[PDB]
Amino acid sequence: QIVWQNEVRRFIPQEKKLTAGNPMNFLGMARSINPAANTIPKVSAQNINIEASVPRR
């Protein structure tokens, strides 16, 4: 049995429909794999000594 009331209620515009190359197809995929961002590494350049902390090998 196929029913048309829910299809009429679920109708979406074709210009709002997603095509192949739209990155919004992978928007839910990026929701699925939530990337782990970095906590901000607070650094001050004034506390850095140029002569010593530069590598030497």
């Binding site: 196929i2 048309w4 299809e7 515009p13």
Partner: protein, 160 residues
């Protein structure tokens, strides 16, 4: 538009446009705010008119969604509502143009052969555009309803 019609006719007669067409062009230019207002009203209510008119068509004529029908299937009904959105878009084009030439050049030439091929009933398509006309006229003000329903009955008259 009427500008395109007048320029095309004057070009075919190999003459400049007379003031008897120039006053018509400037009158169409000045009387544009009402057509623009009807256009943004229709594109604001572009979804709900399509939803209600599709609901009214499939409750009035269940042979469309009957087994063995042309639109039996969820994707078939989705494409039917997409065609309703197409013709509503063409009605907005004709409203904002002030002329029937966009509807004629986009979605009226070859429609009979097209739906004769696809098997879709042309009188039911005319009923769909008529139901969009009734929903839009109920949704908007009466003079604007008559102005939009003018292009709507042009579409259903070219349909049938």
């Amino acid at each position: 538009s009427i500008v395109t019609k007048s320029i095309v006719n004057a070009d075919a007669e190999a003459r400049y446009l007379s003031p008897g067409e120039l006053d018509r062009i400037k009158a169409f230019v000045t009387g544009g705010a009402a057509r623009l207002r009807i256009a943004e009203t229709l594109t604001g209510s572009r979804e709900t008119i399509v939803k209600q008119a599709g609901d009214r068509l499939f409750q009035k004529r269940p042979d469309i969604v009957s087994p063995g029908g042309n639109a039996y299937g969820e994707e078939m009904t989705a494409t039917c509502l997409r065609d309703m959105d197409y013709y509503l878009r063409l009605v907005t084009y004709g409203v904002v143009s002030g002329d029937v030439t966009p509807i004629e050049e986009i979605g009226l030439v070859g429609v009979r052969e097209m739906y004769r091929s696809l098997g879709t009933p042309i009188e039911a398509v005319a009923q769909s555009v008529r139901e969009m006309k009734e929903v839009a006229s109920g949704l908007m003000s009466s003079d604007d309803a008559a102005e939009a329903s003018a292009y709507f009955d042009f579409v259903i008259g070219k349909m049938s």
